[PDB]
């Protein structure tokens, strides 16, 4: 079964990952480069699925197929430690995460039951240029690995990982980045999720959170209380004319970390140009008409296995003139103004400078960052600049 701590993991044997070009769990890494020479010929045939299951590439432009994808994900995707909450991926959100610039339909890899055509499996790859230490390499970001609950523990996830690798090798890419809540060989960096309450009562009824030892409900609300309006001057939603400068600010600010994306202006528009109930981005235009900072957070509500828990996830926040503490404080205010219930943020990047000061509490979940077929020293959360 899954393992959530490395202590838990170092006892486990990895029947699949020991066969993969990833550093072993105990191995200390001080080299820089791939684990495997690029393959000159790639298997033309799809891998063999267990009897009664077939490959199918999902055309998310077909609204019916996209409906099949979110229904699969909304019923069988990531859950919390206690099986109380499950992500509620909207169709318009998945198009955002699954059709960025450069997407390929054969990278929307799904598994269907042969007889019924019922979608029972999925995995995805989107292209991304990744800066890791001192190498800028083109990789894919693997996301949305999902085997239906009725098919679990039958070694169908390894087949999905192999088949998506094959389809990415065919396009000439040989590295990949991905995250996870479980420990596998081998985390290049471990990031903790932190949680800032915005509506304490909602998260206490639903049992997302709990009242601290000697603290009433009344005090808890007066504690997380926030201003009605933000305080940074010139804060406003990002517009079309801000795509160049948001690219500029993000391109530069990101260079101080060791694992970061490398975005074209077309990609910066896609990932940051606001879409309601998907992505939000606010820029800080100063008294001279210049844009100096921006904050961003994306929307991902969670079904409650017992309405929905509206969560805001901190995305990329770039500061040059506004103090990051004030920037992130206004982010909390804007999230509250928009009806969110909680503001989730990792401890990666400079987030540790404000997580305690802005009343974040620590979460019971770590997000391990992995690289496929790339052997490099691991880093701390503050060096991981990839959300």
């Amino acid at each position: 079964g899954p393992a959530k701590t490395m202590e838990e993991a170092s006892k486990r044997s990895y029947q699949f990952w020991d066969t993969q070009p990833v550093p072993k769990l105990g191995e200390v890494v001080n080299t820089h480069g791939p684990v495997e020479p690029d393959k000159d010929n790639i298997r033309q045939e799809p891998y063999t699925l267990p009897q009664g299951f077939t490959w199918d590439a999902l055309d998310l432009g077909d609204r019916g197929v996209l409906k099949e994808l979110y229904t699969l994900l909304n019923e069988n995707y990531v859950e919390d430690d206690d099986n109380m909450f499950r992500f509620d991926y909207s169709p318009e959100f998945l198009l955002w995460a699954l059709r960025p610039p450069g997407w390929l339909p054969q990278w929307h890899c799904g598994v269907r039951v042969v007889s019924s055509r019922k979608l029972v499996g999925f995995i995805s790859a989107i292209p991304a240029n990744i800066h890791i230490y001192d190498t800028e390499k083109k990789m894919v970001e693997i996301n949305f690995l999902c085997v239906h609950k009725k098919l679990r523990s039958k070694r169908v996830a390894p087949v999905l990982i192999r088949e998506i690798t094959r389809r990415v090798h065919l396009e000439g890419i040989f590295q990949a980045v991905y995250t996870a809540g479980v420990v596998l060989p081998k985390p290049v960096g471990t990031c903790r999720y932190w949680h800032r309450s915005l509506n304490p009562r909602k998260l206490i009824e639903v049992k997302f959170s709990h009242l601290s030892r000697n603290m009433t409900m009344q005090r808890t609300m007066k504690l997380y209380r926030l201003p009605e309006t933000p305080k940074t001057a010139g804060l406003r939603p990002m517009e079309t004319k801000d795509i160049p400068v948001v690219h500029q600010l993000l391109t530069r600010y990101l260079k101080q970390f060791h694992l970061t994306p490398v975005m074209s202006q077309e990609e910066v528009e896609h990932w940051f140009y606001p879409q309601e109930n998907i992505i939000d981005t606010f820029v800080v235009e100063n008294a001279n008409g210049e844009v100096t900072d921006f904050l961003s957070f994306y929307t991902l509500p969670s079904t409650i296995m017992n309405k929905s828990l509206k969560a805001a996830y901190s995305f990329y926040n770039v500061h040059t003139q506004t103090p990051l503490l004030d920037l992130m404080s206004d982010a909390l205010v804007l999230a509250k103004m928009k009806g969110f219930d909680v503001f989730n943020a990792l401890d990666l990047m400079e987030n540790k400078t404000f997580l305690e000061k802005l009343k974040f509490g620590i979460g019971d979940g770590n997000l391990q960052y992995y690289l496929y077929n790339w052997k490099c020293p691991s880093m701390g959360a503050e060096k991981v600049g990839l959300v």
Partner: peptide, 8 residues
């Protein structure tokens, strides 16, 4: 792929 964390 994400993970669902929540306050310790």
């Amino acid at each position: 792929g994400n993970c669902f964390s929540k306050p310790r």
